[PDB]
Amino acid sequence: EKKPATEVDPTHFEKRFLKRIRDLGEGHFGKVELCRYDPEGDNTGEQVAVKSLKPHIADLKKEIEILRNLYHENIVKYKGICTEDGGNGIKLIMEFLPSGSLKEYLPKNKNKINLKQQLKYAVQICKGMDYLGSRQYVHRDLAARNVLVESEHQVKIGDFGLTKAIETDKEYYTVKDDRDSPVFWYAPECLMQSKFYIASDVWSFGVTLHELLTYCDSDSSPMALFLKMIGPTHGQMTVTRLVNTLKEGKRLPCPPNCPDEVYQLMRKCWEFQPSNRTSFQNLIEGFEALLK
Numbered sequence: 539e540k541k542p543a544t545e546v547d548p549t550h551f552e553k554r555f556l557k558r559i560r561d562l563g564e565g566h567f568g569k570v571e572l573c574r575y576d577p578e579g580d581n582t583g584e585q586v587a588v589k590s591l592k593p594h595i596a597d598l599k600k601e602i603e604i605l606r607n608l609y610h611e612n613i614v615k616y617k618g619i620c621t622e623d624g625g626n627g628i629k630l631i632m633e634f635l636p637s638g639s640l641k642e643y644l645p646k647n648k649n650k651i652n653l654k655q656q657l658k659y660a661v662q663i664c665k666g667m668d669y670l671g672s673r674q675y676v677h678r679d680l681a682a683r684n685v686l687v688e689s690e691h692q693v694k695i696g697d698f699g700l701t702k703a704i705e706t707d708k709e710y711y712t713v714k715d716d717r718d719s720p721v722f723w724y725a726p727e728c729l730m731q732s733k734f735y736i737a738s739d740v741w742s743f744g745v746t747l748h749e750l751l752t753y754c755d756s757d758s759s760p761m762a763l764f765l766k767m768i769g770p771t772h773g774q775m776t777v778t779r780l781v782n783t784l785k786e787g788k789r790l791p792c793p794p795n796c797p798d799e800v801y802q803l804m805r806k807c808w809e810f811q812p813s814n815r816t817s818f819q820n821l822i823e824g825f826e827a828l829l830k
């Protein structure tokens with residue numbers, strides 16, 4: 539067969555040149571690893587973040603198609619895919635951000651990162667989220683560990699494994715498997731009825747903001763703080779207890795050194811009724827007013 543010219547697709551990453559360095563993070567079905575795409579074989583190739591399945595293909599495939607089509611400075615950049623001649627299997631290739639998530643970066647840089655800079659992170663997170671909301675997506679997994687640091691001045695939403703499209707004319711996505719829910723980040727309606735509204739992402743932003751304000755310290759994490767509030771030994775009764783505490787109107791406490799006007803913005807993310815929650819737009823305005 540007279541075969542045509544072998545054109546280069548910059549988004550096609552060959553498996554044979556994708557060399558593992560270390561693990562970056564892991565769910566239950568997926569893992570991300572730092573790799574070097576090193577076709578010259580001399581360890582000068584580009585570092586990239588590679589997400590694959592643990593030995594759900596259709597899910598990863600939809601995550602790829604979602605990220606590939608998102609274009610925003612506060613959203614991690616798709617770089618491409620890795621596929622094998624055999625087929626079926628696929629890995630997602632993302633830019634690698636050396637500073638990691640807020641979980642790695644914040645505890646190491648307390649001295650550099652003050653309140654104004656935190657509030658700018660908060661604005662950038664809201665802008666990425668708002669951009670996402672406008673494409674009719676609910677993220678469902680917003681948490682400090684899913685916010686990457688591009689530079690001391692810039693963050694990016696850095697994973698989309700649970701992201702779902704909201705149907706046209708509907709206001710929420712109804713979820714089926716919820717076993718692996720980040721319950722300490724989830725709004726009541728997600729916990730009780732398993733429905734996800736954009737306002738549900740707003741709630742999760744509320745807690746992500748808390749983590750940011752406490753610099754992602756483990757003893758101040760939403761999980762640790764909630765378990766302390768309700769009892770850490772209730773096992774299968776934990777979510778119920780959690781739902782009650784929220785129904786009772788309890789919320790995470792104000793972080794030390796968090797000024798009440800920032801805390802009050804946080805509170806509006808946690809109004810019990812979805813409809814009463816501030817929007818990402820309002821949040822952006824509120825934050826911007828504090829930065830003037």
Ligand SMILES: Cc1nc2cnc3[nH]ccc3c2n1C1CCNCC1
Nearest residue numbers: 562563570587633634635638639697
């Ligand atoms: C911890 C971490 N560091 C990253 C650097 N670059 C990345 N690029 C894409 C992810 C990603 C990174 N991650 C996590 C983010 C949350 N999901 C697991 C990996």
